Design a protein around this ligand. Structure first.
Ligand SMILES: CCNC(=O)c1c(O)c2ccncc2[nH]c1=O
Ligand SMILES: CCNC(=O)c1c(O)c2ccncc2[nH]c1=O
Ligand code: NI
Ligand code: NI
Ligand SMILES: [Zn+2]
Ligand SMILES: [Zn+2]
Ligand SMILES: [Zn+2]
Ligand SMILES: [Zn+2]
Lengths: 577, 577
C-alpha cells in the first residue's frame, strides 16, 4: 500500500577526493542540492575503530508512541484552533509554553486532566504528577505542579467555558542491554533473525503503524546526547587517552566529525567566539522503528550524519528549493490556526507520509544508510526517517561559504516569525572579517558580497530612525552581553549591529526593524545603541577585500606566496609541479 | 632562616585495611584529626596507570607573583580599612564586588588607575582593558569596561575625596610543553638537575621569596579544572573507553577518587539529589614554587588529594580545634576592618608563614607528598602549600557520618557571616532520611541524633513566628526551586525547611532566623511557607530509627539478615565464619 520514493544519489570517492571533505562536498553541491540529501561511501579501506565501550555506556531512554507520534492529527489541530479563538474572544491571546525543551501538548493535557474529573479534581487529589508522567515528561523535576500552573492559566478557563456554562472569575539502560532489548523486540515481531528481515518490508510496516489506530506500538530511543558529556564514538586527541598508532590516522581525518567544524572551509573555524551549541557532535542510539520527525537544522545550513554501526538508518530527503512548498501543504490543514501561530507550524512534530507530499507535487527522495556510511543534509533540506534496528550514529551541523547568504536569509525568516536565534549571524560575519588572513579565500570573497549588502541595509535602518526623532547615540559592545539580554522586544532576534533603547526600561530592547514597539515614550530623547560608527565601511571591507582580491590577482616565489598566505590548491598547484 | 614545622603522620595500611577507604579513615580519625591532616601510602603493589594523555592535553594556565601573592599586606589592609570608613561617612556601606569567580582587588585597582592618571583619564584613553590585564583578569571577556562601572561606583568618589579636595556629584599550554617549562625553570634557578635539589632547600627558598621585595618572581600553574570537562587521571567506566583488564582493578577501587563519593559510607552516596560541585574530582597541575593559600574546604568536610606523578607537593595543615584560634591572629591585623566585613577575612587570600602561626601558639604540622601517595584533609582543617616542581594531582571532597553535626554547625557560621551555601545541609539530611534502607547504619544512627535537634530547633522557630503576628501558612517544595531564589534576604542561607514571604515582593525571601528583615510590612497577614506540616516528626524519625535500632538489637539467619539489610562486617562477621 505504501510506496517507496526515489533513491537519493550516492558517491564513492577516491582516496584523493576523500582528502578534503568540504571541497568534495562543494564538488557535489550543484548536484546533491536538488535531492536535499545524499549518501557517501568512504573507501572500504577506511574503517575507524569505535572509541566507546558498550558494556558500560549508560543513557536515559526517551520514548515514542507511533499512534500519537503524529502531533498534527485533525483532532489536535481543531482543538487548538478553538482554544485560540477562545482566548482571542477573551481579549487575550493563546501562548504555548515550552516545557522540557519541547512545546506543551495542550490537547493531551486537557484530555487527561478532564479524564480524571478536571482541574480542581486533579488539584485536590494531587494527581498532577501522575499526569506529566503519562505526558512523556521526566520526573521528578517538578513538572506536575508546573502543569497545574499552566492548565489554570490557560486550559481551566476553557475547561469551564467548554464545560457546563460557568466562567465568572478569575482571569487575566546500557548500550549493551539496549541492543539485547532492541534485537529481542525486532525478532519476536517479524519472527526472524533481525538481520534477515528486508528493508522494504520494515519500511512498509512502519508507515502502516503511524496511521493505524487498530493497535498501539511503543519504542525506545536516545538523543539529545553530546560528545562533550557522553564522549565521541571517534578517536580524537584531548588529554584523556594515549591515542593508539592504529587510531592516529582516523583521529586526524577531517571526516572524523569532531574535526569538521575547525576545517578551514568551515565558518566556525578559526573564529574562537562562542559556543554555537554545535561545534560538537550529537549521538543518536536507535532501535527498530525509532524515528525522527520532519524538521530542518537550526539556522538551516548543513548537517552531516554518520552511522557508526548497527542495522541501517532509513532517510527521506526533500530539496531546499521545495522548502516553502512543503510548509505550504502542511499549512493547508489548519490555515486559520497557523495564521495566529506562524511558528507553531515548526513547533508541531510531524511525520507526513511521503506519498502525500509527492501527490501534492513535492520532490521526495530517500535512502538506506548502512553502517560505515555518511549522510549529508543541505541548507533548508527537510529530512526525517527511522532506524531499521539496533544501531548507533553521530551527527554534527556545519556551514560553508555558499551558506552565508542563506544564513542571512535565514535570520530574516526567524525575525519574521518570532523565533529565538541560537546566535547572531551578523556577529559571525565580523568575527571572520576581523581576521582576514588564514581565512579560506572562498569565505573572504563571499563575505565581501554579503557584508556590503548589510552595510547598505544597516545605514538605511540607521538613517531611517533619526527621522523618527531619536537624538543621542550611545555605543555598546553586544557580543559581550548575554544573548537573552540583547534580543529584541518583539522579533525575537539577537542584536549586534544596532538596536534602540528608551528610558521606559533600564534594559529592554528592540532591533531597528521594530523601533516603535520598544515603549510608548515618544522618539524624543534617544537612544540608538550602535556598534560601529560607520567608520567601519572603509576598515573591515578592506582586510577582507584585500585577501579576496589578493587571490584574484595572484591567479591572473608565486608558489611561495600561496604557501605563506595559505591558499588552496587542487587544480592550479598541479600545473606547478 | 626559615624553620620547618613538625611532620604530620603517615599511614601505610595493609591490603585488608586498604580495601575500604572510609572505614580506614574513621579508624584513623581520632588520631589524624589532631594533626588536621595526614599522609597515606598505599601498598607499593598499588600503581594505577595514568589514563590521561599528556602530549596533547590543553589547559589555560593561571599565574602567581609571589610578592603580591599576599593580599593581607599592611598597605592593602589600611587602604581597605580607610575606604570602608569613607563610605560609612557617606551613609552608604562598602560592598566588595566579585569579578570572575573571585573578589575584586580595589587597592591594586586604584593604585593602577591612579598611576595612569585616574578615572576620567583612563576612561577618555580607553585603557580599562590594559588595567584588567595587569590585574591578571583573563581577556577578552569584557572585564575592562566592567571595572570602570565598579571604580566609578566605589573608588571614583574616594578618588576625588582622596585627590585634591572636590567630591560634589554624583553619588548613590600543554602538559608536555608545561613539563618543559617547569623543568627548565627549576634547573636554571638552582643550577642543578631538577630531581637533585633537596626538599628542605626549596622550602626555605620559597618562604624567602614571599616577604622579599628584594626580587620579583613569577610562576605558572593550573587549577579550577574538572574531571568532568578534562577527564580524570584515573581509569573508570563510563562509555568513553573499553577498559583494559590491567586497569579493571584500579577502576573499581574505592581509592579511585571517582568512586569515593558513591561509597556506602559517603553522604553523597545513594542520594541522587543535586550537583554538589564535588561528586567529581578536580585537577591541579603544578610547577616549582606554584602555591595554594590557606583555606578550609566549603562546608568544612574533607579533601582527599592524590598526587599522580612528578616532583613532590609540600603541605601545611592545622587541626580543627585550632581553627578558631587560627582566624583570630589573621584578624589581629585589621580588627576594625574585619568588624564591618566579617567574611572579608576568608575572601582575602593569605600565606602566613608557619613560624608566625607557631609563635602565635597555633599548631602547625606538615609533610612531603610524593607521587602515589594520598593526602587527607579533616573537617575545618586550615591548609596551604606549594609544589616542589613539575607534577600532576587530583582531588575530591567528601562527607562522612562524623561530619554531619559539623556541617550543620558550618551553616550556622555561614549564616552568621553573609556566605552563600553551596547546598542546604538540612535538605541533604531529609533526602537520606527518606531512604532509610540501603543507607549505612552509622549515618542512620547519626541522622536521628542530628535530625531530632533540628525538629526541636525548627519547631522553636515555627512557634516563634506566630507570636510575631503571621497567620496564613502556605506550603512549598524548596528543593525544586533554584538555590539563589530560596535564599534569605539577609542571611544569606538556602532555605528548605521553612522561610517567610510577604506580598511586598512576589518573590523575595528570608530565613526564619531573620523574619524581621523581609520588609517593613507589618506581620499582619501571613506568610509562612513551610515544607512539612509537623506530621514529619513521627514519619521520618521512624524509618531511620528503624534501621538505626534494627541493628542495635541485631547485635544484641542472623548472618542472613545482615546480608539482606546490607550490614557492615569486619569484626562481628569474623566470629561468624
Ligand atoms: C531515533 C534517534 N534519532 C535519530 O536517529 C535522529 C537522527 O538520525 C537525525 C538525523 C538528522 N537530523 C536529525 C536527526 N534527529 C534524530 O533524532
Ligand atoms: C598549584 C596547584 N594548586 C594546588 O595544588 C592546589 C591544591 O593542592 C589544593 C589542595 C586543597 N585545597 C585546595 C587546593 N588548591 C590548589 O590550587
Ligand atoms: Ni536533522
Ligand atoms: Ni583544600
Ligand atoms: Zn525586531
Ligand atoms: Zn519610549
Ligand atoms: Zn510584604
Ligand atoms: Zn536566611
Amino acid at each position: 500500500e505504501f510506496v517507496p520514493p526515489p533513491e537519493c544519489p550516492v558517491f564513492e570517492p577516491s582516496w584523493e577526493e576523500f582528502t578534503d571533505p568540504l571541497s568534495f562536498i562543494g564538488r557535489i553541491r550543484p548536484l546533491a542540492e536538488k535531492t536535499g540529501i545524499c549518501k557517501i561511501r568512504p573507501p572500504k579501506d577506511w574503517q575507524p575503530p569505535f572509541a566507546c565501550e558498550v558494556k558500560s555506556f549508560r543513557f536515559t531512554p526517551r520514548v515514542q508512541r507511533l499512534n500519537e507520534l503524529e502531533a498534527m492529527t485533525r483532532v489536535r489541530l481543531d482543538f487548538l484552533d478553538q482554544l485560540a479563538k477562545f482566548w482571542e474572544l477573551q481579549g487575550s491571546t493563546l501562548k504555548i509554553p515550552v516545557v522540557e525543551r519541547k512545546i506543551l501538548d495542550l490537547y493531551a493535557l486537557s484530555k487527561i486532566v478532564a479524564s480524571k474529573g478536571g482541574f480542581e479534581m486533579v488539584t485536590k487529589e494531587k494527581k498532577w504528577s501522575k499526569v506529566g508522567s503519562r505526558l512523556g515528561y521526566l520526573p521528578g523535576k517538578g513538572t506536575g505542579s508546573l502543569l497545574k500552573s499552566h492548565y489554570e492559566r490557560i486550559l481551566y478557563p476553557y475547561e469551564l467555558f467548554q464545560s457546563g456554562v460557568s466562567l465568572m472569575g478569575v482571569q487575566m539502560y546500557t548500550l549493551q542491554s539496549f541492543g539485547e532489548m532492541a534485537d529481542n523486540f525486532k525478532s519476536d515481531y517479524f519472527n526472524m533473525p533481525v538481520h534477515m528481515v528486508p528493508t522494504e518490508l520494515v519500511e512498509k510496516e512502519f508507515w502502516r503503524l503511524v496511521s493505524s489506530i487498530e493497535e498501539d506500538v511503543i519504542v525506545e530511543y536516545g538523543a539529545d546526547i553530546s560528545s562533550k558529556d557522553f564522549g565521541s564514538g571517534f578517536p580524537v586527541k584531548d588529554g584523556r587517552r594515549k591515542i593508539l598508532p592504529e587510531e592516529e590516522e582516523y583521529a586526524l581525518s577531517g571526516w572524523n566529525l569532531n574535526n569538521m567544524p575547525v576545517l578551514e572551509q568551515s565558518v566556525l573555524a578559526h573564529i574562537n567566539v562562542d559556543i554555537s551549541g554545535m561545534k560538537v557532535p550529537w549521538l543518536y542510539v536507535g532501535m527498530c522503528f525509532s524515528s525522527f520527525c520532519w524538521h530542518i537544522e537550526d539556522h538551516w545550513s548543513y548537517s552531516i550524519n554518520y552511522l557508526h554501526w548497527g542495522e541501517p538508518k532509513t532517510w527521506y530527503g526533500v530539496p531546499s528549493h521545495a522548502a516553502e512548498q512543503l510548509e505550504e501543504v502542511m499549512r493547508e490543514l489548519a490555515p486559520e490556526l497557523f495564521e495566529s501561530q506562524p511558528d507553531l507550524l515548526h513547533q508541531l512534530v510531524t511525520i507526513m507520509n511521503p506519498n502525500v507530499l509527492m501527490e501534492h507535487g513535492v520532490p521526495v527522495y530517500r535512502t538506506n544508510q548502512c553502517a560505515g556510511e555518511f549522510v549529508v543534509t543541505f541548507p533548508r533540506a527537510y529530512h526525517s526517517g527511522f532506524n531499521q534496528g539496533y544501531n548507533f550514529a553521530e551527527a554534527v551541523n556545519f556551514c560553508t561559504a555558499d551558506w552565508l547568504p542563506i544564513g542571512r536569509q535565514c535570520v530574516n525568516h526567524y525575525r519574521r516569525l518570532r523565533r529565538h536565534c541560537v546566535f547572531s549571524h551578523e556577529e559571525l560575519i565580523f568575527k571572520m572579517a576581523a581576521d582576514p588572513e588564514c581565512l579560506d579565500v572562498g569565505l573572504a570573497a563571499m563575505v565581501c558580497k554579503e557584508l556590503t549588502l548589510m552595510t547598505e541595509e544597516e545605514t538605511r535602518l540607521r538613517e531611517s530612525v533619526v527621522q523618527m526623532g531619536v537624538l543621542m547615540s550611545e555605543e555598546e559592545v553586544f557580543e559581550l552581553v548575554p544573548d537573552d539580554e540583547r534580543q529584541c522586544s518583539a522579533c525575537r532576534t539577537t542584536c549586534f549591529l544596532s538596536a534602540l533603547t528608551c528610558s521606559c526600561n533600564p534594559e529592554r530592547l528592540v532591533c531597528l526593524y521594530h523601533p516603535t514597539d520598544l515603549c510608548p515614550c515618544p522618539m524624543q530623547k534617544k537612544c540608538l545603541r550602535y556598534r560601529y560608527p560607520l567608520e567601519d565601511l572603509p576598515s573591515l571591507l578592506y582586510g577582507v577585500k584585500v585577501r579576496a582580491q589578493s587571490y584574484d590577482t595572484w591567479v591572473s616565489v608565486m608558489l611561495e606566496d600561496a604557501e605563506d598566505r595559505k591558499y588552496p590548491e587542487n587544480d592550479l598547484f598541479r600545473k606547478l609541479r
